[PDB]
C-alpha cells in the first residue's frame, strides 16, 4: 500500500529516532515518531499497536515493524474530512458558515501553542469580506495549502 | 492596590479581544463570552424592593460585612448585575476584598489552582490531593472566600426572582428572565477572575472529556490560554478518564491535553442544532431531551493537527515547548512563548526548503526534551547536522538515513 516517497520519509524520521544505530526504536518512542509523520493515534490505539508489535516483550520495533503499523494506521484515517467535521460542530444553523468570533473562540481554545497575533490574522483571512460569517470549508482548504 | 481589580482588568482585556469581531463592547459594558445580555426596564419601582431584601440578607447573615454597609453593598450588587456595569462589579469585588474576602487561592505558593466542571467531583478532589508529593495542595473555586461570598449574594437575587415574580404574568416573567441572565453573567465574569489566578501546571476535572459551551469552554480555558501565552501557566492537565486510571501515578502525568487525540466532545441537546435535534428522533424520539448531553464523533485534535501543517515548526511548540521563528542569519529557537530573553540559533543551507525544515524539526524532536538542552548554535549543511556549544561537533550524516557520531 506504501509508496516510495513515504517509506523513504518514514525511513529518515525512523533513523533519527533510532539513536544507537541498531535499527530499532523503543516502545515509548513510537507515538512520537508517528505524530512527527502526521498520524496521531489515541492512547488506546497506541496500546493495541504496542501490545501486538511487542508480543515478545523486548520492547523492540524494527523499521519493518514500523512500516507495517504505519500502513494499517493511514488505511483508517481521513485527515481532510476529520478537520472539516471538527469545524462542523460549530455550525448551529448548518449552512457551512460559522461566525468569525466563534472561529476566534475555537482557535484560541484549540490553539494549544498559538499566540494572540497568530489568532488575529487567522480571523482576518478567515474571510476577507466585512461580514462576521466565515466559511469553514474555505478556511481548511486555505490552511491545507 | 486590590488583587481582584488586577485580574479583573486582565479579564477585561481578554473579553475585549474576543469582542474585536462582534465589537459590542462599549467600554462601560464588557461582554462575557457565551452569556447573552438581557436588559429589562422595571425602573426603581422593583429595584428598591430587591435592594432592601438583599440588604436584609447581608444584615441577618453571619458574614464579614459591617452592617452600616449592609444596604450600600446590596445597592452596588443589584446595580452592577442588572445594569451590566463592568466598572460597578469590579468595585463590588474590590469592596468584598476590602472586608477580608480574598479572591486568592488559600495555600499561598503551594496552591495548584484547579478547575472542576464535573459530576463525581468527590472522588477526583482527593485522588489529586493524594498524589501531591511536593506538599502542594490543589484548590478549586469553592475554596476561595471572595468568589464564594459573591456567588452567595448572586443566588439571593436569583431566588428573589423565582419567589417574587411568578412567570404566568407576562411582564413579570420578563424581569425574571433578565435577572437570570444578569446573575448568570456574574458567575461567568467571576469564573474568568478565578482562572487568572492560575499559575504553573493546572488540573481540569472533566469526566468524559470536553463539553462545548460549558464554563470551561467559555470563560475558563480562554483565560488559561492567555495566561499560557504570557508564560504564567504551563501544562493544563485534563482528567477525562474514570478516576481509577489516575492511581499508581505521580502528579507529573495525571491528566492529559484536551488537544490530545481520543478526547471526548459532548454538547447539550438544548440549542444543539434545534431543527437537527428533531432529526435525532430516529433512534429514540424521547431519547434526547433539552438537558441531554450528546457525545460527538469529532476530534479537537484534528484542529491541532491542521495547525501543525499550516504553521512551520508548530509541532516543536506542543511536544517540546520550543518557539522557533524566521530569523536574520538563520532560525531563532526560544523557550515558548519566547518572552524570556534567552535564544539559540538554527542554520540551514536552504532555509526556504520545507523538506530541510522537517529534517531538523524531526532532528530536534528526537534529540532535545527542552530548550535548555540545545546547543547555542545548530547547523544543517550538506546532509550533516553540526552543533557549536563551546567546541564544535558534527552528528548527522544522511546516507539515505540518519546515523550518529
Ligand atoms: Ca536502537
Ligand atoms: Ca521486538
Ligand atoms: Ca451557520
Ligand atoms: Ca466573510
Residue numbers in the entry:
A (entry chain B): 4 to 148
B (entry chain A): 1967 to 2371
Sentences from the paper on this structure:
Subsequently, we determined the structure of DUF1-RIDCBD in complex with Ca2+-bound CaM or Ca2+-free CaM at a resolution of 2.82 Å and 2.90 Å, respectively. The structures of both complexes are identical (RMSD of 1.323 Å). Thus, from now on we describe the structural details of DUF1-RIDCBD complexed with Ca2+-bound CaM, unless stated otherwise. Upon interaction with CaM, DUF1-RIDCBD undergoes a marked conformational change. The C-lobe (residues, 81–148) forms a hydrophobic groove and tightly grips the RIDCBD α10. The hydrophobic face of α10 comprises L2266, I2269, M2272, and L2273, which form extensive nonpolar interactions with the C-lobe groove. The N-lobe (residues, 4–80) αA and αB form strong interactions with the α11, α12, and C-terminus loop of RIDCBD through multiple hydrophobic and hydrophilic contacts. These interactions result in notable conformational changes, leading to a large rotation of α10 (~67.4°) and the rest region (~93.4°) of the RIDCBD. Along with the large structural movement of the RIDCBD, helices α1, α8, and α9 move toward the center of DUF1 by 8.2 Å, 8.9 Å, and 11 Å, respectively. A structural comparison revealed that residues W2082, D2107, and E2186 in the duet-CaM complex, which are shifted by 12.5 Å, 2.3 Å, and 10.0 Å, respectively, upon CaM binding, adopt the same conformations as catalytically important residues W125, E146, and E226 in CD38, respectively.
